[PDB]
Structure formats: structure tokens, C-alpha cells
Amino acid sequence: YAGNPFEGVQLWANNYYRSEVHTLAIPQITDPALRAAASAVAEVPSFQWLDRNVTVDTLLVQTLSEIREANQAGANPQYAAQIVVYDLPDRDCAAAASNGEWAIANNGVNNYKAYINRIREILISFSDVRTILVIEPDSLANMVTNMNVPKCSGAASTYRELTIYALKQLDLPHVAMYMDAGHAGWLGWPANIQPAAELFAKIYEDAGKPRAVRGLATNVANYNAWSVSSPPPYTSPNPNYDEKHYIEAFRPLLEARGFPAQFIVDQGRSGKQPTGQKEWGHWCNAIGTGFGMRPTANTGHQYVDAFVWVKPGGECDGTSDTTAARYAYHCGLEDALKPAPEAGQWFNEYFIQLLRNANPPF
Ligand SMILES: CO[C@@H]1O[C@H](CO)[C@@H](O[C@@H]2O[C@H](CO)[C@@H](S[C@@H]3O[C@H](CO)[C@@H](O[C@@H]4O[C@H](CO)[C@@H](O)[C@H](O)[C@H]4O)[C@H](O)[C@H]3O)[C@H](O)[C@H]2O)[C@H](O)[C@H]1O
Ligand SMILES: *[C@@H]1O[C@H](CO)[C@@H](O)[C@H](O)[C@H]1NC(C)=O
Ligand code: NA
Ligand code: NA
């Protein structure tokens, strides 16, 4: 399929994030400068996540409905949707306890198939709304590096099967799909990049190379630069120390195995470089980060369809409350901002950090 799905469309800024900013953040921010900036960030079009089954029949439909409405009223160019599919059973297999709602051992496969089927039903009813999907962040990447972790080892075949199922069922003509493929600091290491290309290329193949699968999404919910002149200290000794280096190394390996993947790159929290991460693998609520380059299809790069905002900045990565059931070690470190609420919940102090550190500024 020849055609960048981000080209020739405007990207819809969804009302779920807008409401978060306007109802939870702006009333809380006294400083004029920041409050102007906040209102402006609310209009930056970030991905909306289907992180729970209940979102399918409510939020997904609401957003597609609003987009259709805006387009029917004369939006020019028309608006497109950006949605994340994020509800594999045994989700986030490397964590002690995931916020995911389903389990492989408790009818997780069937629940997920129905989930996908219902999404498909809805997408088919909104065939007039160009729809871009990011498929399952924090899933197949674990298969490259975390097979020594029992929940991951045990989830691998199901991850693969359900991913293929999704790629095939959501291969509709008005859709473009990007599978998550970690980031420079995860799969970009020379010991990992080849096995990663293998994995993803093979999935593409077994899925029948569906037209709709455009490629891969990188840096989702992470902080890496697209392109910086010198390597952040915590990146050494990796030559792929930013997404540009990663993707330039990654694409040829994918292509040689039959998957000429185009990429989208999350920059929603990449504005400040280097970050305040003490080590690169410090992924949770990292300090010293800022909103990054605004979403655009004009990337200047042949292999990159668009710079995007996948993880919506200000939505938490995980809780720092050691007394809490889904507490995660990484969220309690010295370079994680604290105290932090549950994953996905609004973390206003983190929002303010991102606003202060925005590059380009608001
Ligand atoms: C070897 O390199 C390192 O590998 C480790 C793994 O061994 C990598 O760690 C993993 O990094 C991921 C970030 O790159 C996070 S993803 C995490 O969970 C989800 C998915 O992104 C996000 O939470 C949700 O966000 C949604 C949108 O706000 C909500 O809708 C939803 O409710 C939330 O659940 C969260 O923000 C992300 O931070 C893994 O948790 C981590 O194990 C490491 O990156 C490599 O360097
Ligand atoms: C998922 O949501 C649908 C409505 O979209 C509901 O019919 C279904 O029962 C939900 N799944 C589970 C396992 O509860
Ligand atoms: Na409306
Ligand atoms: Na391999």
C-alpha cells in the first residue's frame, strides 16, 4: 500500500484529553503563562487509548462520532482519528501486577477476540473516518528481551496469535495500523535489533501482509529524542541512541525479511534532552522531561510517516505508592516524580513539568 495515512488530513484532538486538561489541570494552575500553555496543549492531537473494554462502546464511538460531525460540517482537510488498541490478556507481562483487566487463564483470548470484533464492527460503521491505530504497546517487544520472565514466556504465543488476529480483523480500507516496536533503548541495541526484526517481519508475513499494516510505532510512552547531535550519557554504549539511528538501522533488517515498515515516532515527552533519567531503562514518570515536537506528517524522513503524540503527557505511567497493589519498582526511584497515582490517571504535577520543559515552548 502506497500512501502515508497522515498525509492530507488534520489530526483530531480528542475531548477525553481536552477535558482532562480543562477540568483537572487548568483550574489547578495559578500562573498565567502556564495556563495559556495548558489550554494550547489541550488542542495538540494525541492518541486516544482503548485501555479498557468499556471504552469501546463509549469513548471510541464518541470520538468517531465527533470526528464525522466535524468533517460533515466542513473541516478542511478532514480530521482523522488516532486510536491505541491496548487490552491483551496478561497485559504488560514483565510487571509484577498489570493494570490489564483480562487473563489468559480466565478466558482472556475469547474476551480479546470479542474486543477486537466489536472494534471492527464500530470501525466498519465509521468507514468515512480515516482511522490510524497503534496496536498493543508494551507487548511483542517483551518477547525480544524478557523471555526469562515466566509471565512473558508464558504469554508469548498468545501475544502473537492475538496480534495476528487484530492485524487481520482490523485490516479495513480506511484503516492504517502500526505495531508497537519498543524504542531505541529497548530493541535498538545491536544484540536485540535483529531478533526484533525477525519477530516483527514474521508476524507481518503470518498475518498475510495485510494492506492496512503500514509499519511500526516507536518510543511509545518513552522519552527518546528523534535526533540529537550527541548521545545522552545514559545511552552509552548504544550507537542507536535516538529514534532516528534506531529506525535507520531497523528498517533494512525488516525489509530484507519482507516487511518494508514505515514508522511513527512518539515525541510527546521528548522535548527536553537529555532527560533526567539516571539510567535509560528508567521508564516511569521520568523527571526532567518536556512536551516535544508537535505531531506532523512533515518529518523530512523517507521511513517516517509522522511524528506523533501517542502517550498523552500528564497521564501517569504507574503509581509510586509502595503500599499499593500495582506498585512498580521503577515508579519508586529517585528519578521518578512522586507521589504518583495509578497508571493512566491524571498526574498534574507531571503535566506541569512537561509544560515547563516544552520544546518548542507553548
Ligand atoms: C531493555 O530496555 C528496557 O526494557 C524494559 C522492559 O524490560 C522497558 O520497560 C518497559 O518500558 C515501557 C516504556 O517504554 C513501559 S510502557 C508503560 O505502560 C503503558 C503502555 O505504554 C502506559 O500506561 C498507560 O497509558 C495509557 C495512556 O496514558 C493509559 O490509557 C493506560 O491506562 C495506562 O495503563 C505507561 O505510561 C507506560 O509507561 C513498561 O511499563 C516497561 O516495562 C524499557 O523501556 C527499556 O528501556
Ligand atoms: C466487552 O464490552 C462489550 C460491550 O462492548 C460487552 O458486551 C462485553 O461483555 C465486554 N466483555 C467482557 C468480558 O465483559
Ligand atoms: Na458533537
Ligand atoms: Na531470533
Side-chain angles (χ1 to χ4, degrees):
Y1 188 76
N4 176 355
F6 286 85
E7 164 177 24
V9 286
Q10 289 193 72
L11 299 171
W12 180 251
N14 72 75
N15 277 306
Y16 178 88
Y17 187 79
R18 184 179 280 105
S19 293
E20 280 180 320
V21 171
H22 282 278
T23 74
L24 304 176
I26 276 161
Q28 259 16 101
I29 296 171
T30 60
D31 175 355
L34 289 192
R35 157 194 192 124
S39 157
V41 185
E43 302 310 312
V44 176
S46 61
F47 274 72
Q48 175 161 33
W49 292 57
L50 311 180
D51 65 320
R52 290 162 294 133
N53 189 36
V54 75
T55 62
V56 172
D57 266 355
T58 57
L59 307 186
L60 175 62
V61 175
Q62 175 175 56
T63 282
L64 290 170
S65 298
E66 280 165 5
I67 289 170
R68 167 179 287 160
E69 187 172 66
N71 289 344
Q72 272 177 359
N76 165 85
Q78 68 181 319
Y79 280 111
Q82 306 172 92
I83 303 295
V84 187
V85 178
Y86 187 52
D87 211 7
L88 283 168
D90 277 29
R91 214 178 65 199
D92 313 295
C93 63
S98 177
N99 311 253
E101 73 202 328
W102 294 327
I104 294 183
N106 199 13
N107 214 36
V109 161
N110 286 338
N111 292 349
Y112 189 80
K113 295 181 168 186
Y115 177 67
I116 288 305
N117 289 351
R118 183 53 187 152
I119 289 171
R120 181 202 163 84
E121 284 180 26
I122 290 168
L123 294 190
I124 287 172
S125 72
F126 278 100
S127 65
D128 55 327
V129 177
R130 188 191 297 195
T131 298
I132 296 155
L133 307 175
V134 162
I135 310 294
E136 301 289 346
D138 192 31
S139 73
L140 297 182
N142 290 292
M143 269 82 268
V144 174
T145 61
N146 285 322
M147 292 296 282
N148 59 289
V149 175
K151 195 174 188 168
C152 290
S153 167
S157 64
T158 301
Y159 277 19
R160 183 199 158 271
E161 158 186 19
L162 295 187
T163 293
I164 290 160
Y165 189 81
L167 299 177
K168 288 175 90 154
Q169 296 304 133
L170 306 177
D171 173 30
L172 302 169
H174 65 291
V175 167
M177 280 176 286
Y178 298 86
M179 279 181 275
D180 182 80
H183 63 86
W186 191 346
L187 304 189
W189 290 96
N192 297 334
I193 198 168
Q194 187 137 251
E198 224 150 78
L199 184 50
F200 291 104
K202 162 135 217 270
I203 290 180
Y204 185 59
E205 182 176 297
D206 290 353
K209 305 192 182 202
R211 183 212 56 83
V213 177
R214 177 60 174 184
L216 306 175
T218 65
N219 206 41
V220 178
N222 213 280
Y223 314 102
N224 300 343
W226 158 243
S227 177
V228 276
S229 45
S230 56
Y234 47 77
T235 63
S236 185
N238 190 349
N240 296 318
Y241 56 79
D242 59 23
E243 300 296 309
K244 175 177 177 147
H245 278 80
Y246 177 33
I247 289 164
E248 280 184 2
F250 204 14
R251 174 48 183 269
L253 301 161
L254 290 160
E255 181 137 25
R257 305 154 176 73
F259 182 21
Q262 290 288 111
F263 289 81
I264 59 173
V265 184
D266 202 346
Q267 289 286 285
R269 307 193 285 175
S270 296
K272 189 166 163 37
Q273 303 290 339
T275 69
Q277 297 164 283
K278 303 255 69 103
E279 306 280 350
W280 210 356
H282 291 186
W283 59 265
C284 189
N285 304 325
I287 60 173
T289 63
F291 284 117
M293 48 177 56
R294 315 291 197 265
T296 179
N298 313 300
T299 59
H301 200 292
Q302 78 178 135
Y303 298 151
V304 190
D305 287 342
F307 296 133
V308 289
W309 283 19
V310 191
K311 167 65 184 190
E315 290 175 12
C316 199
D317 298 316
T319 182
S320 59
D321 176 321
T322 53
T323 86
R326 293 163 261 287
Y327 173 64
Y329 166 74
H330 285 92
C331 298
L333 304 162
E334 142 207 339
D335 54 9
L337 192 70
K338 297 184 240 30
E342 290 283 331
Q345 294 298 310
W346 191 262
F347 190 180
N348 204 65
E349 294 94 319
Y350 198 89
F351 182 73
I352 296 162
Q353 178 194 294
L354 285 171
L355 218 44
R356 291 203 196 271
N357 292 330
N359 181 2
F362 279 101

